[PDB]
Amino acid sequence: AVKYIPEPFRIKMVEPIKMLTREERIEKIKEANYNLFNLKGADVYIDLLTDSGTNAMSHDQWSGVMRGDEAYAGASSYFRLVDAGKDIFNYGFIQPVHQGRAAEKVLFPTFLSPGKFAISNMFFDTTHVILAGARPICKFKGNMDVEKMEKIILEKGPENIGLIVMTITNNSAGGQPVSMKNIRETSEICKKYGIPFNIDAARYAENAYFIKRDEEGYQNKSIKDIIRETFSYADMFTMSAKKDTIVNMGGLIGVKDPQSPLILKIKANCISYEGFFTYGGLGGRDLEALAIGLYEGIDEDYLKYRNGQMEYLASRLDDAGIAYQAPIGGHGAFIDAKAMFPQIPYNEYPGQVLAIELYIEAGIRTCDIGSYMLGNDPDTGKQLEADFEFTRLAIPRRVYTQSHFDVMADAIIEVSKRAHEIKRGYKIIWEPPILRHFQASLAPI
């Protein structure tokens, strides 16, 4: 096995959880129509459904919550945020926004005229985007296939590609990172063919660690700098802060160039969608927690602990013989449901079978990243077959302990030991035509 990294903090406030029996948990998931999204938080012991804005802040951040300035125009709480923003990244301009998705709505359009296409390093997407994720063909997976991109900027005109977005770490692979090298190289093609380069930075901090730890020549290099370097190869960044700023709400747009015409556009855009640009849909409370949490997320001791959780969980899973995305990513594990349940074909949803079944085991709450989540064909209506059947364990930051990770690994191993008994997957009782998996009702066969 491997050793866990003990928390470079101590616990100051706890949220008590009601403990259920398995017979109770069975009733819960049956009452939710076997859709884990219909469970009540109160009935979930370890909630791994997402790492987005479910983190535990510090008593420093809560301190700033009480000091939060709620002024419409010009809150003091706003400058402390932009001052951090300009420090950490060294960008010229920083703009608060309420959600990660709202950062894109504010910025992307100015450069992305309807009809222009942009390439990213992703595998899945909700979207006119061109996906050139480097084939896993393991280390630093989730790079951009710089070759593929470079040729895509020619099969599709150069003055046509609206922009390139490198999201770091790459979510759609499992949180795998991006090499300082894959960033210079993606940068290079961007300056030649004149395309703007944006970094989607939701898990930028976990990414910097993965560089310090793995990319050759960043061993003794400062985390603070490994960040500030990544944001030299980019014209701009958009961010969901709910991730690596260990916060509960917020998003951030930054443009390196202080004089970049985008700035006057972003302010006007923000005023229209979010509100006056010195709170950007964000509260004084949240601006404070976000200017402080920007730095907690960077601290190298916290980054080592956090990487170590993942390492610990992966070691433990190696050791029991369970299949997961081999180089485990920044923020959690992806269990291969089709491997544990070869009896369940894709259309019976092996992902939900594991997810449902892990909840029944220890009140852990996961979600299918597989055929259930993929949905039905937008035109044919027919159920799509996913490349992989994963169930995802997304880990909110600074909230679960080693003891909970043992609750997770162990619950996984228990379903393995009895997987052979579930002879049938699930079937869909009712579903809307769109965002199916959020809403649908299922039953067993």
Next chain:
Amino acid sequence: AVKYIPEPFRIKMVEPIKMLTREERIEKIKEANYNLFNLKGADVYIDLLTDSGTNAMSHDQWSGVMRGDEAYAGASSYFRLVDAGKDIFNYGFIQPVHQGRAAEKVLFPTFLSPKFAISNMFFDHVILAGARPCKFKGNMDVEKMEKIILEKGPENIGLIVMTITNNSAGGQPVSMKNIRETSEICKKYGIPFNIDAARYAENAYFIKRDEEGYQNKSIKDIIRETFSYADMFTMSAKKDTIVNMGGLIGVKDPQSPLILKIKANCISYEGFFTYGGLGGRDLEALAIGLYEGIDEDYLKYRNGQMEYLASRLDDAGIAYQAPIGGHGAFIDAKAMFPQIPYNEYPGQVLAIELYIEAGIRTCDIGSYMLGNDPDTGKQLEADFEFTRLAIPRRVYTQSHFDVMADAIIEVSKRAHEIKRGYKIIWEPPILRHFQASLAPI
């Protein structure tokens, strides 16, 4: 001669304000290009930009903040907020959203196919039909509305929206009868009826205070009645729910098929529909604030703030937009600066002078605000020139209100000494009033 109504509460926590030199303040505004929006809030004493999202909460709301469930799906806080809304409004479906903008963004798409909406608002595919401005001056001109419906053809009227209180008119309330009569014309033509409900409680008190035969009904019943006439409502919670973040959609009929579109629209625009862009803390604060903002003792106090201020303005013969609305005061800036023509911005001079005289931040609701012509760029001549004093809830005391009245009278007295207003130096193409740069002549 009106007397202030004492706060039904005591102060529990304080935000200290650094007091500035009248000398010191002038540098602070010159330094900020004579545009109030550039002032740092720390250099503002009475800050009256908006009543949106600047309210003081209660300790009950804050113990809410500490208990807030941050779960992505199924949080405790969401179910509390849902119950509060179902109970107050007697609707079958209440959707939490992050802003009043988000609630319109999510709800209106369904029926507003690129078709008109008719609104009782007075400025802004919207058609306006507020009555010509006496009580209940936010009322919608029902005769004119029916005229429009037929002139466009019912087909082409997608929804009808009544804003209560009618902000565009100063916070002038809408009669319970006006709603009932608007509802009946919607039903006649098969047109959905939505209430814009940001200041529904101030409107509820106004009905109680002035509509015949409601003197005796409770705010609970008054609110339940006014929403029974509608199909749905959208609202920025940042006003009468006494919070700093929130929006809220309600659909009356529990089986309406509109609900699945709302849920789908929300999942995609804001996030999963059990948080809808809000956090644990804010859904908590919101579920408690819903009831605080409609308390009968609070609303009598809230309306008292406003009666008092107006009473003082009347004692000095100051011309304001009368009767005073539910949430602030609009000072006739042209009434007080005739020497100041529209294109030199009488509303922006009075708002600078109030921040010189007493550290009160206000804004212009006049020529300056409304900027140039879409295609000409020549300064538009606003129909009215005002300076808006927008009062956050439970934040300021009778004393602070006296500072306000005092500053208006004093500026009044020396208004004849200013004979020339201001002039945009720098300006963006759109939205200038927020971020333009001014200077005097």
Next chain:
Amino acid sequence: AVKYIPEPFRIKMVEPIKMLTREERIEKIKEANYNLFNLKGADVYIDLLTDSGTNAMSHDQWSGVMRGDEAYAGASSYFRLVDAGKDIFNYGFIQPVHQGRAAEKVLFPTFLSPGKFAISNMFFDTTHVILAGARPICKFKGNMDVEKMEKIILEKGPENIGLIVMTITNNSAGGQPVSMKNIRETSEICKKYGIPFNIDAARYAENAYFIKRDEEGYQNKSIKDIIRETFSYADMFTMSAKKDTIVNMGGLIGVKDPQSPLILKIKANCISYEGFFTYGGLGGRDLEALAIGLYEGIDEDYLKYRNGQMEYLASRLDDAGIAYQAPIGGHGAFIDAKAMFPQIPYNEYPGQVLAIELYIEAGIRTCDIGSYMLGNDPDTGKQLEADFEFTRLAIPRRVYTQSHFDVMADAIIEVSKRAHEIKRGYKIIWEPPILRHFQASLAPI
């Protein structure tokens, strides 16, 4: 009339209050046996029962509440407190304690050997103390009769007087202050006859203002200094922080001399009564609110507002013809109950008649500072006759508005207009032998 001084702050959190009818308030006070101390806070609209620890803090103080260090030995929250303490007063040593009464228990004994007597500037007392309060014989009332004291240090031996305590402002007079001059002069006799001088400093800040405002030659002098001067004429101070540090809990002992042998004694004493001397019975939360609130209480803008409340209330009362302690004190007004109810003799308690009757009027809660509070003779058992019948309005800091002060003045004037109708006072149904007024039950005649 006079103008009120508007708050140099704005309201950030409110505590809602349930509003009662007079018929409801009548039921409350009857159910409490006409003892105002038996009322429930929830049934009191404006609670003037004390200004001790009922103040409203700032969002700065609450900010520090969340950052509070709860370490037993050596909390960071303790040094920020002593650092303020040594700044404001310039004393060498500062020691946190839980209550104002606990500061005395910790310090006084070391110097006050059983049998030695000490003189103060007080009128009443719970106590072997000698009281030499300057006869009102109005301005700067509540000085020490330096003459009387000086002769008391001779009728009672000089090497016998354990210490002199000048409490500022003087509570027992009504919050009237102490002149920088009365402090030098009381200091002088203390250095000659070798007696230690302690300042009881519960309302030191209100006192400094009264000096800046009234004592000749302190007009243009800094509040920060007018404090630091007062604590040059003293060997030590004890303090209930619940007063002019705008806090909810805490007490403070300070000794000017850094090398003063008392220090090693105070630490040992504190360890025995309160706990380890780096929290002194105080919580990390409370140490933070107290190090920040030390400075809010000093701010000259807050001191002008606060003095102005009192001035405003007194002006208004002058104007209606109501009798109160003429030079109104730092922290509230004392209404002369015997003057409004000449029908009620002392033994029928005019104080409680007004107090009860003001509650019935507007849910204001006061207390008798008169014959009811004085109690019965410790030996004879017979009801004592007080010098004055006051009912006290003690004003917590930064919690009530001008509108509430109008609620107070006006409720007073209403009982005046109908005082002639109460033909009889109250009688005691049951009382314990000690601290009578806190506990006793009354009825009307």
Next chain:
Amino acid sequence: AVKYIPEPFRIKMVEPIKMLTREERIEKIKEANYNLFNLKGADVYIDLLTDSGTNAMSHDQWSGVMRGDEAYAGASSYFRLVDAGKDIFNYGFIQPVHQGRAAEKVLFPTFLSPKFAISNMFFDHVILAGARPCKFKGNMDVEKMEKIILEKGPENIGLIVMTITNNSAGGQPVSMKNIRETSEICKKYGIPFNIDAARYAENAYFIKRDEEGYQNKSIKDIIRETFSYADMFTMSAKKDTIVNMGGLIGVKDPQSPLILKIKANCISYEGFFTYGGLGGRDLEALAIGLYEGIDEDYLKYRNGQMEYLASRLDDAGIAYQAPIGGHGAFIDAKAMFPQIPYNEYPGQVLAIELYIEAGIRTCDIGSYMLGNDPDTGKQLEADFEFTRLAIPRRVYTQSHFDVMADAIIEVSKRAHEIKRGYKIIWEPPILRHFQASLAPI
């Protein structure tokens, strides 16, 4: 081979700790005169001085903090706390106080006329009669107690006090039978019986875990039973009620005349009896914490922390004070440093070495603590040499516990390389261990 019990809760707020260099830490302790009490808490990683008042509260407790009534008389918070106590303990009277010291100061005067008290404690007009130290080792030696009562004469025994858990023995629990048997001897001689109840819930779980025929009873019932055998109780709330401030007196019989003395004693020593030296925030936190600290899921977890730690100590053959108590670990320091004689303080060397090895603050419970003779001044030879690891509640994780075990094993392994302990340089006359100054030889 024991497995930790996972926390019945998730972390909601964090206190970050600056990690120090083993090099850096040595300066920090030398700089602090080799006395752990001088270390600044910011330079401590795992801080195990006391479990008194260092516990982590819950968000429910903190929303309590925000709602706390600060009224001088009749505060909401007081009535909540009173109800909690009446309900948990089934007593007629519950008096809030600020500390466990304050509760004894207020209650004991009445009967303890300058007369003896008999206690089951093992160190300290107190007479001790704990059994000679197997389970329930905090038990009171009932036979010896009755011997004493008669040897002094009942007249001269003023009250009898059972401490649960028996701190002086390491947190060793007291049997429900031991209480029942002590109660019966009190009743026989007309002697008041008081429970010292600081760790009553850890004791309740121990009874459930080990006393025959309680495996099936609930903690609610177990606690109600153990207090039914007593007349009154005093307690520091800072331990098993999972708060940072508080004490609490209870009197069983609702009509007892003792109550008016308590109220009078309190009004005079602490303050009016509806706050009793506590504030709004702390009475709130206390009323919620009462129930949290006795939850059955929590107590199984709490006891698991301790079973785990001991299990690790046993895997390495580390000698600790066994069986492990409810609230921490006492490491036999003389067992680990024989080369270290009592007067060179083996407990103070192990506690320095643990803070060198891993930033764990512990303290000596041995010669160093117990200081010189009242009249001689020569170093007393403690009966036992220990180092106390006192575990605050809901603050540390299995990982942190592994740091602790790891640091003890490592120090163990290199203990033979230290052949000479420490030597008081400076010292006060009383209480030296807290504030003395040490150095090595």
